[PDB]
């Protein structure tokens, strides 16, 4: 009935914008599940090495969780 | 086999805002969205004194006016809400089979329950601070029941 | 008790900066609270008192 | 002090704002006040 | 001589302090010049680049 | 000079197109646009 300090939709968007990408599938079962995650690769990395706009935002996209050594 | 476990899920929450106490009679609420931005608030009064012609010759105060400020107070809250990713790598794919629907509701779920008790942990620690900067601009009963 | 309920606003004031205020913003960085009365009570008529 | 003497659109209000004042400001209950007697108590120039 | 004069200027190109620098004139003490290019900078349409 | 700082090379034909298209993605016309559009899709995000 009466409004919030916190909207909770700038709140939904934020954790949207600052969340990390998901971990890159590949699926060697079918080739047809097989030939999207390569494209899905290839895009990744042309939008990840060419230099425009995509470059800069992927990489303040990426976080760096790193595992530890084992005895 | 593998088996799916449920289990129950309770929101022991009361939804209260800062309009909602009688704390808000108190504070005159504005939303300046982009607090973080200012250095420092200020806030002039400018009293004028008026004084008394009196009959017998005394010193007579010409005409004295005060200029205070007052600065703001300004303090943040933080809370730290947690959110595991194996809830949220399920997040980004679509079900397909309906164990992966129970398990994506199941994430929806967890991510909308604690995203919203992050709000109500802000509202509260907003109570929180608004009751304790009323608290500390308290002088006790018995130093005003003189100096007032 | 004399009473069960009170009236009160619903919503919090709503302070944005505006466009003389982001200007005044960017450049010195020092934002007034009302400008459009500081204009009324300067540019606009300042004789007449307040 | 930080205060500022500048000339301004002095928005009138209507409280008690001189309830026990000059005892008050002369202790010391404000952090930074400026008291202007006699010729000092104009608007400053621009 | 390639010339015997030279098409120059009239008079001084004046600039006083209009409205809007008036405020900041008084409770800053800090003018900009052309202050409407300012908010035609800054406001309308400030994705603009230059 | 026998030409006025003037040379009309049929070269630069086939490069108005291939060093065009980098120095104009990041002429800030793509730049706010590849930016508004990464962000149309952290709008599209969390309303799944």
């Given at each position: 009935?009466?409004?919030?300090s916190?909207d909770?939709?700038r709140?939904?968007?934020?954790?949207?914008?600052?969340?990390?990408?998901?971990?890159?599938?590949?699926?060697?079962?079918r080739?047809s599940?097989?030939?999207?995650d390569?494209?899905?690769?290839?895009?990744?990395?042309?939008?990840?090495?060419?230099?425009s706009?995509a470059?800069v935002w992927?990489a303040?996209?990426?976080?760096p969780?790193?595992?530890?050594?084992?005895? | 086999?593998?088996?799916?476990?449920?289990?129950?899920?309770?929101?022991?929450?009361?939804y209260?805002?800062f309009?909602?106490?009688?704390?808000?009679?108190?504070?005159?609420?504005?939303?300046?969205?982009?607090?973080?931005?200012?250095?420092?608030?200020?806030?002039?009064?400018?009293?004028?004194?008026?004084?008394?012609?009196?009959?017998?010759?005394?010193?007579?105060?010409?005409?004295?006016?005060?200029?205070?400020?007052?600065?703001?107070?300004?303090?943040?809250?933080?809370?730290?809400?947690?959110?595991?990713?194996?809830?949220?790598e399920?997040?980004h794919?679509?079900?397909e089979?309906?164990?992966?629907?129970?398990?994506?509701?199941?994430?929806?779920?967890?991510?909308?329950?604690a995203?919203?008790?992050g709000?109500?942990?802000?509202?509260?620690?907003?109570?929180?601070?608004?009751?304790?900067?009323?608290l500390r601009?308290?002088?006790?009963?018995?130093?005003?029941?003189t100096?007032a | 008790?004399?009473?069960?309920?009170?009236m009160?606003?619903?919503?919090?004031?709503?302070?944005?900066?505006?466009?003389?205020?982001?200007?005044?913003?960017?450049?010195?960085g020092?934002?007034?609270?009302?400008?459009?009365?500081?204009?009324a009570?300067?540019?606009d008529?300042?004789?007449?008192?307040? | 002090?930080?205060?500022?003497?500048?000339?301004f659109?002095?928005?009138?209000?209507?409280?008690?704002?001189?309830?026990?004042?000059?005892?008050?400001?002369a202790?010391?209950?404000?952090h930074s006040?400026?008291?202007?007697?006699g010729?000092?108590?104009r608007?400053?120039?621009?």
């Open positions: 009935k009466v409004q919030g916190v909770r939709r709140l939904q968007r934020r954790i949207a914008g600052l969340l990390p990408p998901p971990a890159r599938r590949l699926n060697i079962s080739g599940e097989f030939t999207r390569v494209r899905g690769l290839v895009e990744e990395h042309a939008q990840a090495s060419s230099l706009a470059a992927r303040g996209l990426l976080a969780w790193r595992p530890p050594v084992f005895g | 086999k593998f088996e799916v476990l449920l289990g129950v899920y309770t929101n022991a929450i009361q209260v805002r309009l909602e106490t009688a704390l808000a009679v108190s504070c005159v609420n504005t939303e300046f969205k982009d607090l973080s931005r200012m250095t420092d608030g200020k806030i002039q009064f400018r009293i004028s004194v008026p004084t008394i012609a009196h009959g017998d010759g005394r010193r007579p105060s010409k005409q004295r006016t005060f200029i205070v400020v007052k600065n703001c107070h300004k303090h943040h809250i933080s809370t730290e809400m947690e959110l595991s990713m194996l809830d949220l399920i997040l794919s679509i079900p089979t309906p164990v992966e629907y129970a398990e994506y509701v199941g994430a929806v779920k967890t991510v909308a329950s995203l919203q008790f709000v109500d942990a802000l509202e509260r620690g907003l109570i929180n601070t608004v009751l304790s900067v009323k601009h308290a002088p006790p009963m018995f130093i005003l029941q100096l | 008790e004399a009473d069960n309920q009170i009160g606003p619903s919503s919090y004031a709503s302070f944005v900066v505006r466009g003389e205020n982001l200007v005044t913003a960017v450049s010195y020092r934002v007034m609270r009302t400008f459009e009365h500081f204009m009570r300067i540019v008529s300042p004789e007449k008192a307040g | 002090e930080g205060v500022e003497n500048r000339p659109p002095y928005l009138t209000v209507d409280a008690d704002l001189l309830s026990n004042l000059r005892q008050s400001a202790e010391g209950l404000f006040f400026d008291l202007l007697v010729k000092d108590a608007e400053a120039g621009i």
